[model samples]
Target: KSEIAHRFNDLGEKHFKGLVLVAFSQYLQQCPFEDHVKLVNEVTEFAKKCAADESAENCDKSLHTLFGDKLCTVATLRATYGELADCCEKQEPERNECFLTHKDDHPNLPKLKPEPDAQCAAFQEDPDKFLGKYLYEVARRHPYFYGPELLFHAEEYKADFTECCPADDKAGCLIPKLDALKERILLSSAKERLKCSSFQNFGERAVKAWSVARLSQKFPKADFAEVSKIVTDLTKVHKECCHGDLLECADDRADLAKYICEHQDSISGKLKACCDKPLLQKSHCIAEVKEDDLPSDLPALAADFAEDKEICKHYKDAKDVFLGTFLYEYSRRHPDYSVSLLLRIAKTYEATLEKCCAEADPPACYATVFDQFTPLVEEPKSLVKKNCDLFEEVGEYDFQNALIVRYTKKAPQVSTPTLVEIGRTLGKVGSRCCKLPESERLPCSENHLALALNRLCVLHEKTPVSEKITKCCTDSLAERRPCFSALELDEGYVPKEFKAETFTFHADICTLPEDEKQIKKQSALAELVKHKPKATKEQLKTVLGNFSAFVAKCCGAEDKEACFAEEGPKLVASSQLALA
Candidate 1:
């Protein structure tokens, strides 16, 4: 028995059906001649019932779908080789029928060798000549019997068989292997493996075999104590499942898959109870919502963008990033809407949402992005980027990790330290460049980086763009120019309107000499707009004109965007009022 375990060990413990069949074949064959007819009738009856019920509602086919066929039907030997009654009568193929040409041609074994059939001649010398071949035949027929453990151990089993059983000791080697296998089976501690084999839960047996094989691989160093625990865990899982009794738990489950098919109304009422069952039982509660209930099929948000947009309350799930937004936003953006464009936009949005919002609530965090739709669609070229004042106040985060990963994986590129050096160059130059007004930052970065003055070299060809990277970066363009130009050369480069420029600003033109004398205009604005900036446009512009006069008295050059972010709102309103 131990040798059988060792010999057939390659079949692994999972091929329980195969093991049971091969191991018990002798006992089964040992039955009185007439009992074969009874066994045949019994199994065939069970199989025919299931097959007839396969299409019937509430008659779960999974119970019968084993070895990739009607379970008992395939496993039963009665109808396999020939009709149950005739084969049981021991005529084998019965007088006039053709011989069993090759073992593969039939599923049943011959009860008695009939001499009229030419194939029967070889079997006379060794009554058991066909047994090993029959075992292989059955194993192949039942897929649940195959697994790596079995394959690997089976190979070893054969190798050992060859070594142990020299030509002179065929039965001698065979008997010991079977005996050793039997001993091991009696000692196995895996409860599910034992019980499943006993109950003929053939499908679960297959899965459990793979699970054991996979679990062993995952923790090769697992000790005996740990192995025991894993077996218990598997046992618990099996216990939680419906134990081969297809309709046992379905007694209370009207909507229990098959039961629901049999009776929808009664089953629908028990649907909630089905889900409330144990985790395994909950999986059996199957329901499908109709397509008409889905929002994406024909979006309600499909209306003109120029119109006063109704907030899509339905598109407001916190867990959502773009499904709702994509339906709403892209539908608006593409008026003569092409589903291709919608799909493309949705794809980009979905991809970006995964990387950028992985740790955040995308709907809420990305709501501020809603404001830039007009500019993003209208001007891919000749656009400048300054932080969105409204968005900053509304708590939008710059979700650019996707862009960073894109650039990082652009191609076979530079080293980290090298990229770090490029960053340093960008920072050194950005301090001066961002000091420009909000309106000027976009163009400045583009032209500055395009020119590539500081040798801040990035080797990639083109800058990648997506909805996630709609806004331009604020740092000096010169800082990122070399890298982008390097990136643009790669195949499938995504074009952009922004150009790289050098950070080389000529002090004579880019910056006005410190307006030491501009103290009056600066003082006027500082005092006039400290609260709501209720000052008129004429007055603020008069103060704004003082930039030419050098506001060294109140501001530094690097403080450019900071100054606007703080005062731009009041400047816009107050300046407009003055103009009015």
Candidate 2:
């Protein structure tokens, strides 16, 4: 224990030692009393190892070994800590500071299982064990939360259970206490994650950006003006609360909540259910509602604000509000564009004004800005039309297979599961709209596919694992998928060795199950495409069509096995020649 203090004390003379001791004490409190000495020894060893060789891997390994089933598992730590784990990526002194200051918040945690009915019996039998189990459940889910804060909550639970579990009105007393504790925990967790940390870390600008993106994405169909007002209100409350003015924050939030609940019609119809909820539940309910659908009557394009030269004056007066309005306008007009892409467009506009306003001919310099944005909107439309055209040309199954092959080759770093998901998304779009009237099919396919891509961009915004994928994500919407498709396969990604002899010339091929035959055919096509890396899609499609015909002819021939054996090599040669 003294050694742990010495090590942390050497790191800094500030609160580092106190923080470490608090965390360590809380950790021991959650473990069995009998295990305290062992835990202390292990943690001391971990601190020594870390002090000698400070690396994230060390932290990860130590965390896995020491905290595995006590407070949180390795998986829980990584998930809850999210970007905070990046502290290990820093060099020693800074790395220590990073850990001390980093706020851990990922609100996408799994729900806690309901407490077992046997808790009362367990508490009666071994109160310490019952408290340990209760605290473990809460801490593991919120692994990065302040240890003492969690301990306080656990203490309250223990006190309540001690009083109520053996009472004459046990059930009645225990139920209300547990319910209130759960509610308090839920609200506390949300406030810390959604409000406090964001404000404290990056200030009001970060809070506003987060709020705009979050609210716009959540209520996609709501008017931007309405969303902006809500964001402004939220930012105000957070600024007050996160800076240590809780009373003012609470009053402001209550007033904002009232405004939201009262203005449901102008803001969003989706909020009606949330408003109907009781006063305590209203804010969270509104915060968690499903995203709104695009209204049918949205403007096809945002009004051309740059058409007036006075935009320079407006932009200079209040840059954020002006650009925010620009984002709001563009976002509503193109609800299918990802929030990142919308922000990029707003940024581009901001940059354009910065350059153009400094010029003598500001109007002329800015006149072409909308022209640049036009293609951003139009390109996605054309790309979708081209995809739908291909959908019409190729059958559904082949179209999906082609997509899978295309994405797999271009983005080899993408996992198979995500590739399969992308394929499913495209397949659904095609299957849903390919059979509709021509005019209907085009728009339907475009809108659905755009929305699908937007959702994907949103999902990857926080953790885009590949530079190439990030580039594609930020590219113009129409060009985004094509950009993905054009990316080179991962470096040193070698295809399986191709051997013509691997093709079996068997009469069984003619009688194979229909699903089995299709699988075999798709496998062959994918392999061929992989091997012939330089071949165009059209050439590969030709090879596929020729192989299909050759198989059909062989199945009808006098000797199916012999026919396949003789003609298969020739088909392979044809593919080589065509690619050549």
Best by TM-score: 2
- For candidate 2, lDDT tens digit of each residue in 382-492? 666787777878767778777767765665445444555555567757978778765445445644554445444544554465577767766554345446546776555
Candidate 1 Cα lDDT to native: 0.32
* Regions of candidate 1 where Cα sits further than 4 Å from its true position: 1-166, 171-179, 189-580
TM-score (C-alpha) between model 2 and the true structure: 0.47
Tell me each candidate's TM-score.
0.18, 0.47
Residue 34 accuracy (lDDT) in model 2? 36
lDDT tens readout by residue for model 1, 1-580: 1222222233233333333333222223322333333333443444344444544442343322221122213344554444332323333123111111111211234432222223223333432333333343333332222121222234434444445544465566555665554233212212222333322323443333333332332322333234334534544444322232212222222223333334333223334454454322343333221101112333333232212232233233442422533433443323221222233344444444454355344455434433434443333223223222322332211111112122333321333322333333333234434456553344344433332222222122113232211111222221133234344223333322211121111223324433322222332233233321233434544545543333332245566555544554444444434521
Clashing pairs in 2: none
